[PDB]
Amino acid sequence: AEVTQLSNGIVVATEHNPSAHTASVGVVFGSGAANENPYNNGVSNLWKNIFLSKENSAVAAKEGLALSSNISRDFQSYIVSSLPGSTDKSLDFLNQSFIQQKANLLSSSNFEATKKSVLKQVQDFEDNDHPNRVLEHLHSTAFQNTPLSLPTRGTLESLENLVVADLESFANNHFLNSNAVVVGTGNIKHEDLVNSIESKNLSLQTGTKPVLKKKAAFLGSEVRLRDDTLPKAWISLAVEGEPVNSPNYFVAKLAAQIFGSYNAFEPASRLQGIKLLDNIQEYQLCDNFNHFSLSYKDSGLWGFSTATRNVTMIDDLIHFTLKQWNRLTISVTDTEVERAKSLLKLQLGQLYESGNPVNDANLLGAEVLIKGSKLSLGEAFKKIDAITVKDVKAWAGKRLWDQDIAIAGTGQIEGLLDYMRIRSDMSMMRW
Amino acid sequence: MAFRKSNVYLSLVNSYIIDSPQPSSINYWWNMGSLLGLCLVIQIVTGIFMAMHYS
Amino acid sequence: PQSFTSIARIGDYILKSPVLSKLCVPVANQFINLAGYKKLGLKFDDLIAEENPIMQTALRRLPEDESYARAYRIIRAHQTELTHHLLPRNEWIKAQEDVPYLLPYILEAEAAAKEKDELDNIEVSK
Amino acid sequence: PQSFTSIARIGDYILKSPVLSKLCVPVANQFINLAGYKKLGLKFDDLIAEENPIMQTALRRLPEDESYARAYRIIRAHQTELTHHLLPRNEWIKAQEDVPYLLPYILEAEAAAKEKDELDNIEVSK
Amino acid sequence: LTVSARDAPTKISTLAVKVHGGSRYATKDGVAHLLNRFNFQNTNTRSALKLVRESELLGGTFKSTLDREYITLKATFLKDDLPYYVNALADVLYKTAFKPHELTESVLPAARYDYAVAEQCPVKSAEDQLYAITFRKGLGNPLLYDGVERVSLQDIKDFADKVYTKENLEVSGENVVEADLKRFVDESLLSTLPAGKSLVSKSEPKFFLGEENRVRFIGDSVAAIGIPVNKASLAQYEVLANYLTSALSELSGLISSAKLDKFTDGGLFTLFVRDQDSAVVSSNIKKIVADLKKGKDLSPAINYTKLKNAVQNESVSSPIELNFDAVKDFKLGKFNYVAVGDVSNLPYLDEL
Amino acid sequence: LTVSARDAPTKISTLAVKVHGGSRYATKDGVAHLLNRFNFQNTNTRSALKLVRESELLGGTFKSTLDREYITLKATFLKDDLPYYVNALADVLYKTAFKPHELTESVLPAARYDYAVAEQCPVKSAEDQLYAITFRKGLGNPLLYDGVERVSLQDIKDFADKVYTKENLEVSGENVVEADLKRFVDESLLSTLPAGKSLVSKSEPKFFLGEENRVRFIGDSVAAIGIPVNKASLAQYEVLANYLTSALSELSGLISSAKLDKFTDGGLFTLFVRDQDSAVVSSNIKKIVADLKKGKDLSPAINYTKLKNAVQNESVSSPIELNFDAVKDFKLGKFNYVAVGDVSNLPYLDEL
Ligand code: HEM
Ligand SMILES: COc1c(O)c(C)c(C/C=C(\C)CC/C=C(\C)CC/C=C(\C)CC/C=C(\C)CC/C=C(\C)CCC=C(C)C)c(O)c1OC
After folding, report:
1. Is the CB of F348 less than 8 angstroms away from the CB of E213?
2. How do beta strands A180-186 and A11-16 pair?
3. For burial by CB atoms within 10 Å, which of C32, E298, F273, F291 has the most?
4. Alpha carbons E155 and E31: distance in angstroms, whole number
5. How does it sit in the membrane (chains C, D)?
6. Distance between CA atoms of A202 and A9, rounded to whole angstroms?
7. How far does residue B39's CA lie from ligand 2's centre (Å)?
């Protein structure tokens, strides 16, 4: 009714839904693709993909289980999904996979069939998924020589250099209990799981903490992947944003909300009450964009992302947009702010209140790791609404106005201008 | 588009002094035409101002 | 740029009041004669200045064969005007023809605009 | 615009004569060193001025990955040139590399042109 | 004019207006597509700009969705505002302006783009090939528009008079309070909508078997089958597709796609093998058609299939739930075939 | 390496090099098209500019023609110059430069345009549909290129080595003196061409019957049939098509097109009913298929048919001349079907 949180060594967390047809259990390791290193990159995405190799996934397929997995930057998750009654059928199959079995998934016929498929995997991504590719490199340059930089799915380089002796090197350090959280989502009780958990003995590497690295940092920089053979142009730009559990966590998400997200095709999109939109549409400066305030444990990235078949006029594209961003400091309409608060809520909803347990897991697992607990929607909303204009005019005033940016891109970006232009559009001339 | 590009007058200004695409590699030798236009302006200002007292 | 939406307001009012209508329309009729323009095959909606967005929302919208019509008149206009002449008396647009063929769209679009203007500056009371 | 077809004539001759070749090539070698250009990652076919039709028949024709190659060097050139520096000694194009990658097409095209020139003014004896 | 709504203690309410006018009910080729893409346009009293403008301020968004069966006019909002989006959907159903210009500048355009992303995905290219050769003129209708049949604006309007009727819709609701829905549904223009009659097919559809058609395409190569399954054969091909798409069936890595559709009087079991190499289509279809005819005990995937259909369902309206436990073995009897991509180097049915 | 030449007292001599490498012999989809469109390009000693330039001065022109069977490298000139164009054609066959650039700037381009005028004529759209569903991989090959199968420049060259052989060509000639041809033919590079072997099919082709395929097209509507006739059935469908296209058959104004092709081991009898109205296709094909099955005494058109095949033939190489007089009645047994244009409003085979 307010989400449960109790620890007997294994911090056991759950979240009940009485109208759910199914449920899900799993673990979340409080160390992700940003706890790795330059040459072991993709180790966390390698771990995910053995966990779903036909072997272990045929086991749980007779049982009636489905497994879910994802790696982030600050965190890393291993979830299993099934019918709510077969709730022990989950917990046991989890127990087998992470304390019982070890080299049953770590075969020299398994691992050389997973790594020979996480290699094709990260060779369609950087090959044909430019919007994320661009998005990923954006981190690489903004957070260069620092934790967040390492692409979550790992470089094809440090991904052909890795054997099983390396899957473990990360496992036995960062796959602990004092870095994990067990989650219960969907259609199960707190007294169903934490019972079935204290039912099982053993302890893996107790007392052990996972290790640390130099805290992340940010620096104004570019990286440009020109490719004049690609029909469009993809660009992503940002400033040093705000972390998870930062005073302006919501203030910053409200700002993103204002300019928001465009799709020049859906007539619905064309009518949004966004000021910037007035400009961009005249000549069709782009095909779409969208904003964001990506928050991570140590640092953040407020900016936006755009694709465009309009090559001669990208220079305006970036211009109109970064000028709008100036208003946030000097001239944002209050009535804009309300449409923000309003729309944030709708978005922040379909995020948190989707009828899909697997999401409510990672969400829970990550948050109850970093701050300890989760924060309720009513808590969030109570904050969103407190937000004045002055909220947004002092946040932009430090974060946005005349601060270093972080551009990245690919496709026909000859037209995308230089760094002393772009960066300079962070401000406006004053008397 | 931006105004400086759109205006009948400022578009020239932009396209010859602001948005002009120069080779990335050119050195201080190329600063001569610039400094050439500057003399011509020094010639014409000071000349006129002097002519006011010349016979 | 006195607005059509605004000419509607005024000219509808005058048309309605049997008082006003009897006073005004004789003159107005006398006016749209002295103009000379129906003698250059011109309907009045032809004359409306176009170099502005509303009319370009209003001509993009104007039915095809209707625009071909406009066109011929507009060229017929110029042609004759340059011949420093008036058309064959029986080529003139006749009083029943001079119909506001365009005016809906102009109005249609004006409306649409004033709406968006409003909806861009719509404020909030808490 | 001294012709490549013409540089071929002269430079082939000199290359053939074991007399000439021994006299000239030492110098020529000494020359293509003093130029400085292989120290800006430049192959000599990079240097050839392009603003003329033949070279634009000769670059449209130049194999893809070959043009991507040219490109990187040409940008590497400018970049370095503007840094007012010379490349890391081991980034320099090495003496075996400076190969006439372009020269066939230039020649291929020159040929083609001189032919058409001729065939435009081909006269007739009866 | 059905009406449900499963409440819950949540922040985001939702909604819908599940109508029966997809491809199957399309008058001419893709007139649903022009009507799916005409929704939330201007009504006769509300402007689509104002409809969008106001919605954000209240914090909610609308979405017309098309498929073979539906034109689901769903909304999604914050809870306290349900009647707005309720009357909204209603107001769209009764009185959308259907102006000539709204077509040429917003409907036809938006329509053209959908088909654009279509013509660059061959799996879909063929999934319209299945239906149109198996079921034919019924559910074998072109899903999205393609100008081959000149659907005027009149033809878009008739289809709106047709499919927009009381006896032809089904209101849904999630995190909505059922009484609140029924009331506001009744006080809305919804109830004033000409009731007409249904078009829902209880009498099963005429089908075909062994039919084949091929397509000249520049892209990945894909080949596809089509099976006129029954109101009975429903749960069978459900435990089949979920086995073929799982780690049990050794040939899940020889089939790119496989799933069964569910109508209230039929379905369709299509398997797509797609790849760039025009080989891998001949190499993973000469085998797939075999291994199935040989016989597949679909039973070990009855613990799976249930889970993969109790998560799939989230629409308060579903088909035959309990039907699962009575499955066992499979054998591929007869079937239809569509080959897409490199035709001169892709299999024929006569060798399949 | 056959050689004929019918002299005459005329001013304009002609010529040809009738080769056996049309669609039917195409390695990949339309490699003849790339080779038909690579002829009279640059040889290794002659430039296509000079080839064209000199020709005009002598007063003569060249033309590479494609079809299902041939790649006829015909020329045409003033008489006194025969060896020039003779050695010309020869020089093209042996040593055409086949440069990378000649492709991208002259072959692929010219190829693209042919297909362009193709995609705007549905009768042809379907006449490739007939062949590719009836005969299949043999004569059912794509006539002109279409990028669906990446024919590299290598694949264009192999096909030149293949089809350009002594035992695979047939020199012709009109207003040429036969001895002059044979001599200059022998003194030409022609004789030096790697003889290889033939590809000409004496053994009749595997065919199909009752096969159907349909096409989504924006244009006029057209429906088309296909009949795997024999080396015997040749003269029958000849007196048929000439009757259907004449004032005798009452239904010549219900069929837009109808004719029989002639191979040295087969043919194909295609009837095209084409019109804008998707109706008139359903209205003039439900009847046409009937009136024929009913029975057609093709005999009154045996005085016609001869005339319409003694004027049609002007190539010194023809098929079975005397075969005409032994015809009588016709009856449509089995057949294949292609429908093009408005598919959701055009007939199916199951109703034909
Ligand atoms: C290209 C531009 C010009 C050049 C190169 C030029 C050159 C010269 C030179 C060499 C002298 C003699 C200077 C001296 O030794 O005293 C001179 C004088 C003079 N110039 Fe110019 N001139 C230019 C433009 C002008 C203009 C626009 C005026 C406008 C009135 C002007 C007005 C005068 C006057 C009044 C004198 C006599 C006073 C003096 O010699 O300083 N000049 N000019
Ligand atoms: C392609 O590369 C370029 C490049 O294009 C440019 C433009 C520059 C920059 C160079 C320039 C901007 C040079 C431009 C030169 C001129 C504009 C010279 C033109 C000067 C005139 C035409 C003089 C006219 C002057 C007047 C009318 C002033 C007279 C008025 C008077 C005297 C009023 C005073 C009188 C009273 C009574 C008060 C570069 O550096 C460059 O290198 C990378």
Report:
1. no
2. parallel
3. F273
4. 7
5. Peripheral membrane protein
6. 11
7. 9
